Amino acid sequence: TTALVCDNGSGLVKAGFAGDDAPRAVFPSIVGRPRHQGVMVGMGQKDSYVGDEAQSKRGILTLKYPIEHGIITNWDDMEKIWHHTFYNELRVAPEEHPTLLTEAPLNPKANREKMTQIMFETFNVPAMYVAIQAVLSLYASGRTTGIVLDSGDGVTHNVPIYEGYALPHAIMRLDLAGRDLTDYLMKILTERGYSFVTTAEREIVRDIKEKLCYVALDFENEMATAASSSSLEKSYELPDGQVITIGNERFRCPETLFQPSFIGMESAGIHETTYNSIMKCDIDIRKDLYANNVLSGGTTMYPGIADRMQKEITALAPSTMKIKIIAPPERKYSVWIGGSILASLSTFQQMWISKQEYDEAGPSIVHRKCF
Template sequence: MAEQLNIIYLPTPTLPVPAGPDSYDEHRGKETPLIIDNGATNLRYGFATSAEPHTGPNVIAKFKERKSNKQLLIFGEGVEMDSGARAQARNPWEGDVLLNFDALENALDHAFIQLGIDTDAVAHPVLMTERLCSPLHSRALTSELMFEQYSVPSLAYCVDSVMSFYHNNLPATSNPFVSDGLVVSFNTASTSVIPVMSGKGIFSHAKRIPWGTSQASEYLLKRIQLKYPNFPTRVTSTHTTWMLQSLCEFSPDYSALLRELKDPIKLRASERVLQFPFNAPMEVEKTEEELMRIAERRKEQGKKLQEMAAAKRIEKLLQKENDLQYLTDLREGRGKEGKKEWTAKLQSEGFENDAALDAAIKKLDDNLKRSRKKEVDGDDPEPAEEPSFPLLDTPDADEGLKEKRKQKLLKAGFEARARARREKEREKEEREADEQREAEEREENPQGWADRLRREHETTMGRIKERTRRKVALTDRKSAVAQARMKNIASLAADDRVPKKRRKGGGEDMFGADDADWAIYRKINIAAVSSDEEDDLARLGLVEQKLLAHDPTFTHAQTYHSMTTQRSALLLAMRPQYEEGDVEGNTRIHLNTERWRVCEAWFQPSMAGVDSAGLGEVLQNVLARFTDTEKERLVKNVFITGAPSQLPGLIPRLRSTLRPILRPDMQLEIVRASNPSLDAWKGMADFAQTSDFPSVGVSKAEYEEWGGERIRRWWGGNWNSSFVA
């Protein structure tokens, strides 16, 4: 079953293995460049001569441990292992801007400790990444932290994607870096496009869109929450980030893909089913004696509840009988008093006039009849002999009046039951006679009988569908049905049967005096359930039972219930339904169209509610700033980097986007970074070991003279600063 559904289980988090600090002896007393890739998701750090950097999540948590009641500071993977740490987790980055410098300082402390640096100052030149078009104050505060706190001898900034491009296009000889290309960088909170000509990033023509891995992960989370609003397990951003990296992909033509996935079979074949952890319910087997005891106990409890309900019904009936008798006696005294006294008496009883009193008596009498009918409709067997009610023949007395009224009520109930039984017997005889006539008709002319019932079935279905269409049309205020309803309401408000002068003086409302009023009421009242509809549904069910029993051409799929409750195969394929008791099935998430929709948001951010140009439009805008010759040099090396660049289908999607906006004779080559996660750090390490590196950094003396805004203009760093060397 798991192979058939293509079920995937969420990975189980494992405890990180703490590693001790590195030995500092190799770099002590040497000015080995220190490389720091300060990413929004991961922090990568190490000396330029190292083969691989240290890597860890760029997150820090300060919290008080419950058992020891001590303040703890955790960095990296350990934050996810403790709920208290997760609640206090902080990242140096807010979106695409470096803002939390306390968290950055804690992260750098961890990095320098892991590198084994045990001196008072970090006596190594530092090459550090920053975002494209970073704010000036962010760079200034970072420089202040590095020079004031750690006393680094020099500091240089670079754009990570350009250094990744540098690493993948290193010159074969000692010649200067002169490669051309179009760098597309997929970051955590943004995606940027940077043209590189003759080994220099042209940042004045670079573009950035506010859509990255974090936005895509949140978008996937929202889609899952909309699809599974009552999912029993909490789905977190960590889960959706893993889903994005492991299960999502780009489509070369998203619209064509959706048309293809309209086929439920193809939709089911493309889905991925995620099984979340669940606890299977424990079933305790009971012995036969325990089951018998439980059944007996339930039977006794049911009998007690029935007795209590019967006693309560009798009490309510008696109360209603007393109320009806009191109101009847009140009405009989109508002519015995003067008009003024009678009106005052009515008002003291809560009635405005005689009509209100009559209406209350009628309503209470109808209520009593319905209550008695409910008693009659029970399954009580007919008594062997008629019960006696001796107090009914005795004159009224104060002592036995209550008991006499009770016997009167019981006698009325007994007589009503008897009448109901006789009515049921008469209806049964008529029904049997009708069934006999119908059976004879079916035997004599089976085809005619079936055709007649089918016509009746279609006619009844038509009436029900017409009522449904009318209800739907009433929800649209511009529809003809809704406008006719408003006209009926307006005509009722201007009822001519009551004079205008009398209406102003608070005269009696005559609505309901005519039976036609209630037909209008049913038209204007959307929520009113028509008695005709109930009769049609009952008759429809009876006709369908007969057709199913005697007409082999009539199937369950043609019944009203089947046609109104069936769901489309596409909707069932989109989100299969599991039984209520299936705990395992109800903790599954079926990903189908979401796998491509989330990735398509890079090219159409508007579908996720982001008012921004898509990646294809940005690429077209950047290329439009260059001549055809320069454009041809750029598109020969379209370089993609960043973790999302590893998603399947990205290169075909970019190719289908760029090919239509280029000349047919232009060569288009799209390459992916050899290691999108580490190539930026490796490119920085490669450059830090060249002779050009000392000339791109700002020394501590320059910082003390010019401040943190001082940077140097070079091919790998931001050029858009207002104060550059």
């Protein structure tokens, strides 16, 4: 039979059968209970709208993501999300399909063990396998080397790989991602008068960020230009009218990636953690990693980031090496495409964690040889 390539993610759940080009169903991972009282009788009001249904009734819900930073903080809601994904968005019972979840690097063990225990006890799948979210993004590019920066919505991690041999001592995981950029944008919009507070209006700020923000090639020059002319002010229409005008908030929101001091984080930007991740590698594979830097994940879709990052790394790196940044147009679904490719391989067909194996060793089987 065919395998189910699910990809929990944090912000958008992407799923679909193995062997295709794009995920079949992509929908936000939010579960929102209603918060008001409700007076109409017999309206058929449910107790929790999940997935894309709660992005249409969000006016009277309190949306809450079940995955904070890669890790899962609310297991009941995550179980509800998985149940919805299997039964309503794909309509395939899990009793007859292997599953291939994905997990960020350096995550707590208990999260992974609970994930496999749920998949084997509640949904009762035949066999499931957990894979690191960066190796798949490297599969999708058709490479076999390269250092991949997978800046998702929950957590940004940077896994270097050479000739198929991952370097476990050079993984640099940073917890700045799309959600923190949304919060920072929502916080700097208040400088013009627009106040978004409700958890429903966070979605509106996210839409503003997606449609308007861009990464500046040079930050100081843009700050000077936006403060003199008015060629940058782009307007946007809220879900009820009252258009708003975003000035130099456009390139200040995604600039947080390269200067995490804006949101008070100490660490260095995504332009310098990649160079540090390279320098921890051996001295003989640094040229190949320099030449095959891969971008993935949703948050790396800002217009103009593949040039800013290249300029920064070229500034840091030695002058002789060639710096090349692979930015495929299908960046958002790169991890899932790689997952489909991996699940479609014949050599991989014996790596699944078969159910009888789980019955013999318990949930701690995932840390064992079947990784």
